[PDB]
Symmetry: C10
Subunit: 75 residues, 10 copies
Amino acid sequence: MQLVLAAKYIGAGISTIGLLGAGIGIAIVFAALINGVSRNPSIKDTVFPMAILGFALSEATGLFCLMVSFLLLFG
Amino acid sequence: MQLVLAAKYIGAGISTIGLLGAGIGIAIVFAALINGVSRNPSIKDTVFPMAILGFALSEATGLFCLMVSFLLLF
Amino acid sequence: MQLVLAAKYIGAGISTIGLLGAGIGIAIVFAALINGVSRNPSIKDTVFPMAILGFALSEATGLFCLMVSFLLLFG
Amino acid sequence: MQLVLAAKYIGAGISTIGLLGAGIGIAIVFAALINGVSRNPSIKDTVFPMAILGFALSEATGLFCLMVSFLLLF
Amino acid sequence: MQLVLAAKYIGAGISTIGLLGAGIGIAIVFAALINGVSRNPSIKDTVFPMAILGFALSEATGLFCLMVSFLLLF
Amino acid sequence: MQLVLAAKYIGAGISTIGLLGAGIGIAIVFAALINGVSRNPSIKDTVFPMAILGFALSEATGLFCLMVSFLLLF
Amino acid sequence: MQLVLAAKYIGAGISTIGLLGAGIGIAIVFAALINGVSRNPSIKDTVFPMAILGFALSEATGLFCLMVSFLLLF
Amino acid sequence: MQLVLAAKYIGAGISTIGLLGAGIGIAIVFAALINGVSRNPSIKDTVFPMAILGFALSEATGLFCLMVSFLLLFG
Amino acid sequence: MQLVLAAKYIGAGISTIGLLGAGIGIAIVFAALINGVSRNPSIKDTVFPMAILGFALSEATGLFCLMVSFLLLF
Amino acid sequence: MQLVLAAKYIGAGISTIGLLGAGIGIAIVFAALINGVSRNPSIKDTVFPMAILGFALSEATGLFCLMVSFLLLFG
Ligand SMILES: CC[C@H]1/C=C/C=C/C[C@@H](C)[C@H](O)[C@@](C)(O)C(=O)[C@@H](C)[C@H](O)[C@@H](C)C(=O)[C@@H](C)[C@H](O)[C@@H](C)/C=C/C(=O)O[C@@H]2[C@H](C)[C@H](C[C@H]1O)O[C@]1(CC[C@H](C)[C@H](C[C@@H](C)O)O1)[C@H]2C
Ligand SMILES: CC[C@H]1/C=C/C=C/C[C@@H](C)[C@H](O)[C@@](C)(O)C(=O)[C@@H](C)[C@H](O)[C@@H](C)C(=O)[C@@H](C)[C@H](O)[C@@H](C)/C=C/C(=O)O[C@@H]2[C@H](C)[C@H](C[C@H]1O)O[C@]1(CC[C@H](C)[C@H](C[C@@H](C)O)O1)[C@H]2C
Ligand SMILES: CC[C@H]1/C=C/C=C/C[C@@H](C)[C@H](O)[C@@](C)(O)C(=O)[C@@H](C)[C@H](O)[C@@H](C)C(=O)[C@@H](C)[C@H](O)[C@@H](C)/C=C/C(=O)O[C@@H]2[C@H](C)[C@H](C[C@H]1O)O[C@]1(CC[C@H](C)[C@H](C[C@@H](C)O)O1)[C@H]2C
Ligand SMILES: CC[C@H]1/C=C/C=C/C[C@@H](C)[C@H](O)[C@@](C)(O)C(=O)[C@@H](C)[C@H](O)[C@@H](C)C(=O)[C@@H](C)[C@H](O)[C@@H](C)/C=C/C(=O)O[C@@H]2[C@H](C)[C@H](C[C@H]1O)O[C@]1(CC[C@H](C)[C@H](C[C@@H](C)O)O1)[C@H]2C
Ligand SMILES: CC[C@H]1/C=C/C=C/C[C@@H](C)[C@H](O)[C@@](C)(O)C(=O)[C@@H](C)[C@H](O)[C@@H](C)C(=O)[C@@H](C)[C@H](O)[C@@H](C)/C=C/C(=O)O[C@@H]2[C@H](C)[C@H](C[C@H]1O)O[C@]1(CC[C@H](C)[C@H](C[C@@H](C)O)O1)[C@H]2C
Ligand SMILES: CC[C@H]1/C=C/C=C/C[C@@H](C)[C@H](O)[C@@](C)(O)C(=O)[C@@H](C)[C@H](O)[C@@H](C)C(=O)[C@@H](C)[C@H](O)[C@@H](C)/C=C/C(=O)O[C@@H]2[C@H](C)[C@H](C[C@H]1O)O[C@]1(CC[C@H](C)[C@H](C[C@@H](C)O)O1)[C@H]2C
C-alpha cells in the first residue's frame, strides 16, 4: 500500500508537466490577436471570437492533464 | 502486484506529457487563422475549415496520449 | 509512511516544471503588445486589455501547477 | 516478474512523449497552409495536397511512438 | 527520516527547472522592447512601462519555482 | 535476467522520445515548401525535390531512434 | 547517510538544467540588439542599455539555479 | 553484472534523445534553402552547397549520440 | 561510499543538459549577426563586437553547467 | 563496484542529451547564411566566415557534452 500511494503522488506531479503546453499555447493565440488587431483594427470583432475558441481548445489539453492529476491524487 | 500497480500510476502520469504538443499545436493553428484573416478578411470562409481540420488532427495526437493514460489507470 | 512522504516532496518539485509555460507565455503576450503598439500607437487602449486577459489565462495554467505542488506539500 | 510487467507499463507511458512532435508538426503544416492561402488565394488547390502530405508524414512519427507503446502494453 | 531528507534535496533541484521559462520569457519581452523602439523610437516612453510589467510577471513564475525550492530545502 | 529484461523495455520507451524531432522537422520542411510556393508559384518544380530531400533526411533521424528501440525490444 | 549525500549530488546536477533558459534568453536579447541596430543605426545608444538590462535580468534566473546547486553541493 | 547490463540498455535508449536536435536542425537548414530559392531563384547553385554543408554538420551531432548509444549496446 | 560515488556520476551527466542552451543561444546570436550584416553591410564593425559579447555571455551559462559537472566528476 | 559502473553508463547516456543544442544551433546559423545570401548575394564572402565561426562555437558546446560522456565511459 506504501508503494502505491507514493506512486500516485509522483504520478500526480508528473501529470502537471503537460500544462506548460496550454500556458504557451494560450499566449500564442493572444499574441496573434494583438498583432492582428494592431495591423487591421477593423478586424477586431471577427478575430476576437477566434481567439476565444483557440484559447479554449488549447486550455482543454491542460485540463486533461489536470484531470489525470486529480484522479491520481483522489480517485 | 504493488509494484506493477505503482508502475501503472507513474506510467499514467508520464503519458500526459505528450499533451503539451496539442496544447501548442492547437494554438499555432489558431494564430495562423487570426493572422491570415487580419491580413485578408475576404479569405475567412476558406481558411476557417482548414483551421478546424488542423486543430482536430493536432488534438488527436494528445488524445492518443490520454488514451494510453486511461489504459494504464484502469 | 517514509516512502509516501518522500514521494510527496519529489512530486511537489516535479509539479513546478509546468510553470515554465506561463513564464514563456506571459512574455509572448507582452511582446505582442509591445510590437503591436510600436507599429500602431493609436491601438494601445484596444490591445492593452487583450494583453491583460491573455496574461491571466496563460498565468492560470501556472496556478494549477502550483496548486498541485502545494497540495502535495501541505494538503 | 513484477519488475518486467512494471517496466512494460512505465515504458509504454514514456513511449507516448514523442507524440508531442506530431502535435506541434501537424499544426506547423496547417498554419503554413492557412498563411499561404491568405496571402495568395489562387494557390489553394496546389498547396492543399502538399499540406495533406506534410501532415501524414509528421503524423507517421507519432504512429511509430504509439506502435512501440502498444507493443509494450500487449 | 534519511529517505525523506534525500527526497527534499532531489525535489529542491527539480524545482529549479521551471526557472528556464523566466530566463527565456524575460528575454522575449526585452527583445520586443528593443525591436519596437528601433522601428519607432518615438514610442519608447509608452512601451517601456509595458516591458517592465511583462518581465516582472514572467519572472514571478520563476520566483514561484524558487519558493518551492526553498520550502523543500529549509 | 528480470532486471535486464525490465531495462530493455524502459530503454525501448525512452528511445522513442527523439522521434519528436522528426515530427517537428518534417513539418518545418513542408511549411517552407507551402510558404515558398504561395509567394512564388513558378518555383514549385525547383523546390519540391528539395523538400523531399529535406524531409527524408529529417525523418531518418527518427528512424535511427526507432531502430535502437527495436534492437532493445527484439 | 549514503542516501542523503547521494541526493545532494544528484539534486545539484538537476539544478543546473534551468541555466539553459539564461543561455537562450541572453542570446535572444543580443539578437534583438543586433537586428535593431542593423535596421536603425542611430538607435544604438538608446537600445544598448536596454539590452544590458535584459541580459542581467535573464542571467539572474541562471544565478538562482546555480545558487541552489551550490547550496546542495556545500 | 545484471545491474551493469540493465544500465547499458537504459543508457542506450537515453543516448538517442539527442537525435531530435538533428531532426529539427536538418529541417531548419532545408526550410531556409526552400525559402531562399523561392525569394531568389537565381541563387540556387550558390545556396544549395551551403545547405548540404549545414545538413552534414547538424547531422554529425546526431551521429555522436548514436555512436554512444551503440557503444553502450555493443562495445 | 558506492552509492555516493554513483550519484556523483549520474549527477555529472545530468549537469551537461543545460549546455543545450548555449548551443542554441550562441547560434541565435550569430544568426542575427549574419542577417543584420546582409541587410546593412555598413553596420558590420558596430554589431560584430555585440555578437562577440552576446555569444560569450550565452556560453558562460553552459560553462557554469560544465563546472558543476567537473565538481561532481572529480 | 556494480553500482558505480552502472552509474557511469547511465551518466554517459544522459551526457549526450545536450548535443541536441548544437544540432539545432548549427542549423540556425546555416539557415541565416542561406537567407542572408538569398537576399544579398554580394554579402556572401563577408557572412560565410561568420557562419563558420558561429557553427564552431555552437558545436563546441556539444563537444563539452561528449567529453563528459567519454570521461564517464572510459576515464
Ligand atoms: C472548455 C475549456 C475552457 C473553457 C473556456 C471557455 C471560454 C469561453 C470564454 C467566454 C471564457 O469563459 C472567458 C474568457 O470569459 C473566461 O475565461 C472567463 C470565465 C473568466 O472569468 C475571464 C473573464 C477572466 O477574467 C479570467 C482571467 C479570471 O479572472 C480567472 C479567475 C480565471 C482564469 C482561468 O484560467 O479560469 C479557468 C478557465 C476559464 C477554464 C476554461 C476552460 O474550462 O475554466 C476553469 C473553470 C472550470 C474548470 C474548473 C476549469 C479547469 C481547466 C483546467 O479546464 O477551470 C477556470 C478556473
Ligand atoms: C487568473 C489568474 C491570474 C489572474 C489575473 C488577473 C489579471 C487582471 C489584472 C488587472 C491584474 O490584476 C494585474 C495585471 O493588475 C496584476 O497582475 C496585478 C495584481 C499585479 O500587482 C501586477 C501589476 C504586478 O505589479 C506584479 C508584477 C507584482 O509586482 C508581483 C508582486 C506579482 C507577480 C505575480 O505573478 O503575482 C501573481 C499574479 C497577479 C497572479 C494572477 C492570477 O491570479 O495571482 C497571484 C495570487 C494568487 C496565486 C498565488 C497566483 C499563482 C500564479 C501562479 O497564478 O499568483 C499573484 C501572486
Ligand atoms: C501516415 C499515416 C496517417 C495517414 C494520413 C493520411 C492522410 C490522407 C488524408 C486525405 C486523410 O485521410 C484525411 C485528412 O482525409 C483524414 O485524416 C480523414 C480520414 C479524417 O477523417 C479527417 C477528415 C478528420 O475529420 C479527422 C480530424 C477526424 O475527425 C478525427 C476523428 C480523426 C483524427 C485522427 O487523428 O485520426 C487519425 C488520423 C487520420 C491518422 C492518419 C495516419 O494514419 O490515422 C489514425 C488511424 C490509425 C492510427 C491509430 C493513427 C495513429 C496516429 C498517431 O498515427 O491514427 C486516425 C485515428
Ligand atoms: C543579475 C546579475 C548579473 C549581473 C549583470 C550585470 C550587468 C551589467 C553589465 C554592465 C556587465 O557588468 C558587463 C556586460 O559589463 C559584464 O558582464 C562584464 C563584467 C563582463 O566582463 C563582459 C564585458 C565580458 O566580457 C564577459 C563576457 C567576460 O569576458 C566573461 C569572462 C564573463 C562571463 C560571465 O558570464 O560572467 C558572469 C556575468 C558577468 C554575471 C552577471 C550577473 O552577475 O555574473 C557572474 C559572476 C557572479 C555569478 C557567479 C554569476 C552566475 C550567473 C549564472 O548568474 O556570473 C560572472 C561570472
Ligand atoms: C558528416 C555527417 C553526415 C555526412 C554528410 C555528408 C553530406 C554530403 C552530401 C553530398 C550527402 O552525401 C548526401 C546529401 O548526398 C546524402 O546524404 C546522401 C548520401 C543520401 O543518400 C541522401 C541523398 C538520401 O537520399 C537519403 C535521404 C537516403 O535516402 C536515406 C536512406 C538516408 C538517410 C540518412 O540519414 O542517411 C545517413 C546520412 C547520409 C549520414 C550523413 C552523415 O554521415 O550518414 C549515415 C551513415 C553513417 C552513420 C550510420 C550516420 C549516422 C547519422 C546519425 O549521422 O548515418 C547515413 C545512414
Ligand atoms: C572547435 C570546435 C569545432 C571546430 C570547428 C572548426 C571549423 C572550421 C571549419 C573550416 C571546419 O573545419 C569545416 C567546415 O571545414 C569542417 O567541418 C571540415 C573539417 C569538414 O571536413 C567539412 C568540410 C565536412 O565536409 C564535414 C561535414 C565532414 O564531411 C564530416 C565527416 C564531418 C562532420 C563533423 O561534424 O566533423 C566534426 C567537426 C568538424 C568538429 C568541429 C569542432 O572541432 O571536429 C570533429 C573532429 C575533432 C573532434 C574529434 C571533434 C569532436 C566534436 C564533438 O567537438 O569532431 C569532427 C568529427
